[PDB]
């Protein structure tokens, strides 16, 4: 804790913790955006996806079940970090409100994903396999540990940690979000694609907020440091979608998927105030 007192975002200068005397309208506006986007899992009708999961092909279910499992855990990893870290560190009221809402929405996301799994896998045995993917699946573990490491890293500053999770919510979900949107295009799994639209939207907002926090940070990682955290996330995600769980299992081109991950990484870099790293176009017309 060196020059932390000079951080408007972290400095212990509240001695207020009131609300309306809003100091940061940009942060508050983000929070209001999130509030108005509130939804509950009960709002997604799954009373019809059981049949769709049947018409599906063996390779497809394999891909989906694995993607869902990866989601059933990730949402939790993010949530823990927000609870025992970010929401603790940040002393700015507006930010605390946004983080408080993000937490609630992440739990709704968790519930949504568990609800999906239960609907498709009625066998309580396979259910446990997917629910404990963090330990039952090595592929999902490489990513789980990556994010988990940023939670227990007592050295990494808030600046590095905020970029790492922006990468988790942005790069680690990008491939899966794109895979689901692809299915929607193919007219498959209405329940899965509908919830995916609400979730992807929330993650996009959570990512934009992360970048906004980064900007309110005075002493933050150097550009090179940011490029490597983001780049490590891109490689991890690409390997996951081209080796561990090839998008070919659902009729997607591995190469195009690789390009999309780089595209998403570049947008994140721009939102953080830096230049692009890969300089590639968005290969998917249904993701713009």
Binding region for its own copies (CB under 8 A) = 15-21, 35-36, 38, 40, 72-73, 76-77, 79-80, 83-84, 87-88, 96-97, 100-101, 103-104, 106-108, 110-111, 113-115, 117-118, 127-128, 131-132, 135
Shortest Å distance, C-beta 236 to Co ion: 18
72 binds, among its own copies, Co ion, none (CB under 5 to 8 A by kind): its own copies
In the bound state with its own copies, the residue whose beta carbon lies nearer, of 129 and 274, is 129
Residue of 86, 212, 107, 93 whose CA lies nearest to 161: 86
Q: Which token pair is 173?
A: 């979900």
Structure tokens belonging to residue 191: 């329940």
288 annotated as ligand-binding: no
In the set 24, 31, 99, 113, the catalytic residue is 113
Helical segments of 82-157, H only: 87-89, 93-120, 124-131, 133-136, 138-152
Least Å from the CB of residue 125 to its own copies: 13
Indicate which of its own copies, Co ion, none lies near residue 206 (CB less than 5 to 8 Å, by partner kind): Co ion
Those residues whose C-beta lies under 8 Å from the C-beta of residue 251, and which sit 6 or more positions away, are 182, 186
For position 169 contacting Co ion by CB under 5 A, the verdict is: yes
User: CB-wise, 79 or 259, nearer to Co ion?
Assistant: 79
**Is 106 one of the annotated binding-site residues?**
yes
d(CA 227, CA 217): 17
Report CA Rg, the chain. 19
CA 146 to centroid of chain Cα atoms: 13
Q: Are 213 and 5 in contact (CB under 8 A)?
A: no
Residue pair 159/217 in contact (Cβ under 8 Å)? The answer is yes
109 known member of a binding site: yes
Q: Contacting Co ion (CB under 5 A), which of 143, 206, 216, 258? A: 206
In the complex, the smallest distance separating the C-beta of residue 42 from its own copies, rounded to whole angstroms, is 8
The DSSP 8-state label assigned to residue 179 in this structure reads H
CA distance 243 to 235: 11
75 is in an annotated binding site: yes
- 129 burial (CB, 10 Å; 0-12 / 13-18 / 19+) is middle
CB of 19 to its own copies, least distance (A): 4
DSSP-based helix, strand, coil % in the chain, nearest 5: 75, 0, 25
* Residue 42 known to bind ligand: no
Residue 129 known to be catalytic: no
- 167 contributes a contact to Co ion by CB under 5 A: no
Burial 12-44 (b: 16+ CB within 10 A, else e): eeeeeeeeeeeebeebbebbeebeeeeeebeeb
91 binds, among Co ion, its own copies, none (CB under 5 to 8 A by kind): none
CB closer to its own copies, 88 vs 253: 88
User: Which partner from the list Co ion, its own copies, none does 162 bind, CB cut-off 5 to 8 Å by kind?
Assistant: none
Closest CB to Co ion among 110 and 259?
110
The residues assigned a catalytic role are 113
Known binding residues for Fe cation: 75, 106, 109, 169, 203, 206
Residues near Co ion (CB under 5 A) are 169, 203, 206
């Amino acid at each position: 804790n060196p020059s932390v007192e000079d951080e408007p975002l972290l400095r212990e200068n509240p001695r207020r913790f009131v609300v309306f005397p809003i100091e940061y309208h940009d942060i508050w506006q983000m929070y209001k955006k999130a509030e108005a986007s509130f939804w509950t899992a009960e709002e997604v009708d799954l009373s019809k996806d059981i049949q769709h999961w049947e018409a599906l092909k063996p390779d497809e279910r394999h891909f989906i079940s694995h993607v869902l499992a990866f989601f059933a855990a990730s949402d939790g990893i993010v949530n823990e970090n927000l609870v025992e870290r970010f929401s603790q560190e940040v002393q700015v009221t507006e930010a605390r409100c946004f983080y408080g809402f993000q937490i609630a929405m992440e739990n709704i996301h968790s519930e949504m994903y568990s609800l999906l799994i239960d609907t498709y896998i009625k066998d309580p045995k396979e259910r446990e396999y997917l629910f404990n993917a963090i330990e039952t699946m090595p592929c999902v573990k490489k990513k789980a540990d990556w994010a988990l490491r940023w939670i227990g890293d007592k050295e990494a500053t808030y600046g590095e940690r905020v970029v790492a999770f922006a990468a988790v919510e942005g790069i680690f979900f990008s491939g899966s979000f794109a895979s689901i949107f692809w299915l929607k295009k193919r007219g498959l799994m209405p329940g899965l694609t509908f919830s995916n639209e609400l979730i992807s939207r929330d993650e996009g907002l959570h990512c934009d907020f992360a970048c906004l926090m980064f900007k309110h940070l005075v002493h933050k990682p150097a550009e090179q440091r940011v490029r490597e955290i983001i780049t490590n996330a891109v490689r991890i995600e690409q390997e996951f979608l081209t080796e561990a769980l090839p998008v070919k299992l659902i009729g997607m081109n591995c190469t195009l998927m690789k390009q999309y991950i780089e595209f998403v990484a570049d947008r994140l870099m721009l939102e953080l105030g830096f230049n692009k790293i890969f300089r590639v176009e968005n290969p998917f017309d249904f993701m713009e």
